[PDB]
RNA sequence: AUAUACCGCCAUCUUCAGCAAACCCUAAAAAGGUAUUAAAGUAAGCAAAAGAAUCAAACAUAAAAACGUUAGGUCAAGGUGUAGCCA
């Protein structure tokens, strides 16, 4: 049996999101890609470096917004610009989010030497695709 | 003035309008309990494991003048004083209650 | 390395080892480590305006700062106290009352049944357990599957009561199924003056014989522990009962409700025979008390009085009045029921 | 205001025959429709013997005098239920009369279930129909047996839900759980056609009577 | 050190057809619940099916394949519970 990225069946009481519900073979069929860069296109270089930056950027955002992320972040690179699109729960006060955006943007712009912007869409609670 | 306690708010919150022995259960082996209750719950200022309804509450006082407390230990229909196993009071307090009722 | 670090959800899953070959076919406890952490609080004690301290204080725009070594040690100790206090709260528990024994489920209250389809609350009803069987059955899933059969009773203490059997693989599910099924099978039991049955009742349900007796006020419930439990749910306060033959809990519950729900009130007897129903209490002397008068036409033919009745008498009842010594176990001093 | 609502709903119960259902039928009318013909003596149910006039050469005959009394009560009850805007469901499994009974229900303005009855329709209605489904307030059983000669499931299930039942009971039927039994023939087309006509006229009269009662009392409020 | 504490990622039956939960019903239920000219079962899940991919169409091929079985494989991908080393 295949155990990869499959949120296994419980007893109908586990709330899975749309992204979690779909197994790897549904990538490019029902669900898209969380990161979009040009480094895996044919005849393009720097796939290794773009992928390493993504791994870090996901661990950074989880720790910087602990318990406030409703779903996985979406990374969008255009030219040298990096854009982080995160669904965040409305737990923290509004002014605290302005602090973490100013901090996380400046810190990651001086670390990777690119303009980095953070885009946050606030949800009242995690969105449940189905109960499995 | 022991009678004052039974009219105070503290008594109402703890006991309501039920008798003071309503929510008491004796710990014993078997289903049939011993025919006498423990001799006494207090020995030399020490208290036993499961103090009886009278002993567990120090503010309750067994006095002939505190009639409202005494009535709880007498049958309203037959006017017979309950035996100690019925209410679970210790034998010391039961004798003291019987004398106060008499 | 920073890249070999996993999230808390994955770390606890591995450490707890709940899903494993040993667990399914035959203790570590989970903890949350972000419970007390406030965003912006670090071991170094830095103070971040807008994150862990007020952004503006007394009209002054705050700047970055760090707590002194003494101040930080206090904050560290305070959090340690709160964690220990939180652990103490976890240890503290509200003990519930036992039933007929400390390790048995019989006699244990499990609360009211759940609300109905249109917000029909049943807060006035109480549920009591009477039997809990944990039996293993044979099914291809695990070879031998597990099953819990629970018999419960429900009642509002004002004449309405019912019982049901619930089965499930989990004990919690059996409790829910039995509790909500019983609310659909509510008998109404007639109580004489709200505290006792209208008359003596003797019956045999399969191999379980019950013999109930109407008693005066203050007599209490001198009955099988299961009958005491149900009588409290029904609202009967004074009665005697004896159970003989088999002590099967289901036959005793079914047989009890069968007899209590088929009893004849005084008004019914007055209507059937057309005569007055008169009561004579020894504490009221010869005073005749009229407890039921026929609704329609009062008859004028006296009820036939035989010289010698043909009643079928029980040796157990009669034996006492014949002067025969009872058992050492009879009429012992017991706590108020 | 409150008096008017009380008048509409409380006045009808002060008259023995508020809807005058007595005139709709007569013993002679029932005898023309063969309502007195029962099954053979072998098929007789023990709880039907009270209603049987006798055995005419093997065929039990149904006393049409008791039928008139019982039918009067059943029709009166069916009218007060219809007057109060209650839901009435006609139920039968006889396939010869399936279309007739569905046409009758539609004419009355009520409901018919002449098809296979699903287990739990009444005891588990919320799962089948929806959370707030309103169950029938009265069930009229033109036939109380299913096609395997057993009681229709809805006879026991209607008692479980505390629903009164007006049922046509023949010599082989069990009337014990029928609230208002009507002893009579259920097999003959002329007998079933008479009963369907009576139930439809009775329901239409009660519905019309309610409309007239509402207009009179409503008109008084301005006037 | 322990895969006989585990996560992770898999093998095997297997492209086999089943696994699990909420209700309802029984002169009591240790269990069971089907009849279509129908007799108590109902309504949602997961798998299969369908759909998508191999850039028309079909077929085919891949992919998919639940719950369990083998304390199956992997402490040496990485992480990690418990025990052990720290001149
Ligand atoms: K493993
Ligand atoms: Mg114990
Ligand atoms: Mg017939
Ligand atoms: Mg293994
Ligand atoms: Mg090995
Ligand atoms: Mg295709
Ligand atoms: Mg497929
Ligand atoms: Mg092994
Ligand atoms: Zn004491």
UniProtKB/Swiss-Prot annotation, chain A:
Gene Ontology cellular component annotations, sorted alphabetically: mitochondrial inner membrane; mitochondrial small ribosomal subunit; mitochondrion
Ribonucleoprotein is among the record's keywords: yes
GO biological process, one term: mitochondrial translation
Compartment(s) of residence: Mitochondrion
Keywords of this entry: Mitochondrion, Ribonucleoprotein, Ribosomal protein, Transit peptide
Molecular function (Gene Ontology), one example: structural constituent of ribosome
Keyword flag Ribosomal protein: yes
Main location: mitochondrion
Subunit structure: Component of the mitochondrial ribosome small subunit (28S) which comprises a 12S rRNA and about 30 distinct proteins.
Family according to the record: Belongs to the universal ribosomal protein uS3 family.
Name of this chain's protein: Small ribosomal subunit protein uS3m
Organism: Mus musculus
Residues of the full protein shown: 36 to 167 of 167
Swiss-Prot record, chain B:
Signal peptide: none
Source species, domain of life: Eukaryota
Compartments it resides in: Mitochondrion
Quaternary state and interactors: Component of the mitochondrial ribosome small subunit (28S) which comprises a 12S rRNA and about 30 distinct proteins.
Protein family according to the UniProt entry: Belongs to the bacterial ribosomal protein bS18 family. Mitochondrion-specific ribosomal protein mS40 subfamily.
Protein's UniProt name: Small ribosomal subunit protein mS40
UniProt source species: Mus musculus
Gene that specifies this protein: Mrps18b
Residues of the full protein shown: 52 to 153 of 254
UniProtKB/Swiss-Prot annotation, chain C:
Keywords: Mitochondrion, Ribonucleoprotein, Ribosomal protein
Sequence ranges assigned to domain S5 DRBM in this UniProt record: 125-189
Cystine pairings recorded for this chain: none
Any Gene Ontology biological process: mitochondrial translation
Domain of life assignment: Eukaryota
Main location: mitochondrion
Annotated segments matching region Disordered: 21-35
Bias-annotated ranges (Basic residues): 24-32
Localization, UniProt: Mitochondrion
Coiled coil: none
Any one of the GO CC terms: mitochondrion
GO molecular function: RNA binding; structural constituent of ribosome
Family the entry assigns: Belongs to the universal ribosomal protein uS5 family.
Assembly information from the UniProt record: Component of the mitochondrial ribosome small subunit (28S) which comprises a 12S rRNA and about 30 distinct proteins.
Name under which the protein is recorded: Small ribosomal subunit protein uS5m
Upper classification of the organism: Eukaryota, Metazoa, Chordata, Craniata, Vertebrata
Full protein stretch here: 90 to 432 of 432
Swiss-Prot record, chain D:
Family classification: Belongs to the universal ribosomal protein uS2 family.
Molecular function GO terms recorded: structural constituent of ribosome
Major subcellular site: mitochondrion
The protein, known as: Small ribosomal subunit protein uS2m
Assembly, per entry: Component of the mitochondrial ribosome small subunit (28S) which comprises a 12S rRNA and about 30 distinct proteins.
Role description: Required for mitoribosome formation and stability, and mitochondrial translation.
Range covered out of full length: 52 to 274 of 291
Keywords: Mitochondrion, Ribonucleoprotein, Ribosomal protein
Cellular localisation: Mitochondrion
Cystine pairings recorded for this chain: none
Top-level taxonomy: Eukaryota, Metazoa, Chordata, Craniata, Vertebrata
Keyword Zinc tagged: no
One annotated GO biological process: mitochondrial ribosome assembly
GO-annotated cellular components: mitochondrial inner membrane; mitochondrial small ribosomal subunit; mitochondrion
């Amino acid at each position: 049996k295949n155990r990869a990225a499959r949120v296994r069946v419980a007893k109908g009481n586990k709330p899975v999101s749309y992204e979690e519900a779909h197994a790897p073979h549904y990538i490019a069929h029902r669900k898209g890609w969380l990161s979009l860069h040009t480094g895996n296109l044919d005849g393009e270089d720097h796939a290794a470096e773009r992928t390493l930056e993504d791994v870090f950027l996901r661990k950074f955002m989880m720790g910087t917004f602990p318990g406030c992320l409703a779903d996985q972040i979406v990374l969008k690179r255009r030219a040298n610009q990096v854009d982080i699109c995160a669904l965040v729960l409305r737990q923290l006060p509004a002014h605290k989010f302005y602090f973490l955006v100013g901090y996380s943007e400046t810190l990651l712009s001086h670390f990777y030497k690119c303009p980095v912007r953070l885009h946050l869409q606030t949800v009242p609670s995690k969105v449940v695709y189905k109960y499995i | 003035e022991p009678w004052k306690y039974l009219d105070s708010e503290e008594y109402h919150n703890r006991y309501g309008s039920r008798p003071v022995w309503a929510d008491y259960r004796r710990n014993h082996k078997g289903g049939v309990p011993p025919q006498r209750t423990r001799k006494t719950c207090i020995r030399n200022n020490k208290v036993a494991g499961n103090p009886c309804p009278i002993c567990r509450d120090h503010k309750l006082h067994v006095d002939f003048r505190n009639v409202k407390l005494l009535e709880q230990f007498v049958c309203a229909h037959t006017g017979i004083i309950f035996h100690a196993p019925y209410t679970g009071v210790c034998m010391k307090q039961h004798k003291k209650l019987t004398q106060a009722i008499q | 390395s920073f890249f070999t670090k996993l999230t808390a959800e994955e770390l606890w899953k591995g450490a707890l080892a709940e899903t494993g070959a040993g667990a399914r076919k035959g203790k570590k406890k989970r903890k949350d480590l972000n419970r007390g952490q406030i965003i912006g609080e670090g071991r170094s004690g830095f103070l971040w305006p807008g994150l862990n301290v007020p952004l503006i204080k007394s009209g002054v725009v705050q700047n970055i700062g760090q707590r002194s070594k003494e101040e930080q040690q206090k904050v560290e100790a305070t959090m340690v106290e709160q964690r220990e206090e939180w652990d103490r709260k976890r240890k503290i528990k509200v003990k519930r009352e036992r039933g007929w024994s400390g390790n048995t489920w019989g006699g244990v209250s499990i609360g009211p049944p759940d609300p109905g389809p249109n917000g029909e609350t049943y807060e006035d009803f109480d549920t009591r357990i009477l039997e809990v069987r944990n039996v293993f059955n044979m099914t291809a899933k695990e070879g031998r599957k597990k099953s819990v059969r629970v018999l419960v009773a429900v009642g509002n203490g004002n004449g309405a009561a019912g019982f049901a059997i619930g089965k499930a693989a989990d004990r919690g599910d059996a409790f829910r199924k039995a509790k909500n099924r019983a609310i659909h099978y509510l008998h109404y039991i007639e109580r004489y003056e709200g505290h006792t049955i209208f008359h003596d009742i003797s019956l045999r349900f399969k191999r379980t014989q019950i013999r109930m007796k109407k008693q005066p006020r203050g007599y209490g419930l001198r009955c099988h522990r299961a009958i005491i439990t149900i009588c409290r749910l029904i609202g009967i306060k004074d009665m005697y009962a004896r159970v003989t033959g088999s002590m099967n809990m289901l036959n005793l519950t079914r047989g009890l409700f069968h007899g209590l729900a088929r009893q004849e009130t005084h008004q019914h007897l007055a209507d059937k025979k057309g005569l007055h129903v008169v009561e004579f209490r020894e504490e009221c002397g010869p005073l005749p008390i009229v407890v039921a008068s026929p609704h329609g036409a009062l008859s004028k033919e006296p009820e036939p009085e035989p010289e010698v009745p043909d009643t079928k008498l029980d040796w157990q009842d009669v034996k006492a009045m014949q002067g025969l010594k009872r058992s050492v176990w009879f009429n012992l001093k017991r706590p108020a029921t | 205001g409150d008096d008017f609502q009380s008048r509409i709903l409380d006045t009808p119960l002060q008259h023995s025959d508020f809807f005058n259902v007595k005139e709709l039928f007569s013993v002679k009318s029932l005898f023309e429709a063969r309502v007195h013909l029962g099954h053979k003596a072998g098929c007789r149910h023990r709880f039907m013997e009270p209603y049987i006039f006798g055995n005419r050469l093997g065929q039990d005959i149904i006393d049409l005098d008791q039928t008139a009394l019982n039918l009067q009560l059943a029709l009166n009850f069916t009218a007060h239920v219809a007057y109060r805007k209650g839901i009435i469901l006609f139920v039968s499994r006889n396939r010869q009369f399936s279309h007739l009974i569905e046409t009758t229900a539609q004419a009355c303005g009520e409901y018919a279930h002449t098809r296979y009855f699903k287990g739990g329709l009444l005891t588990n209605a919320q799962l089948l129909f929806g959370p707030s489904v309103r169950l029938p307030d009265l069930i009229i059983f033109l036939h109380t047996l299913n096609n395997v000669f057993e009681p229709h499931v809805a006879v026991r299930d209607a008692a479980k839900m505390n629903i009164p039942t007006v049922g046509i009971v023949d010599t082989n039927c069990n009337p014990c759980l029928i609230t208002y039994p009507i002893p009579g023939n259920d097999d003959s087309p002329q007998a079933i056609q008479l009963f369907c006509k009576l139930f439809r006229t009775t329901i239409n009269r009660a519905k019309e009577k309610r409309r007239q009662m509402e207009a009179l009392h409503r008109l008084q409020s301005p006037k």
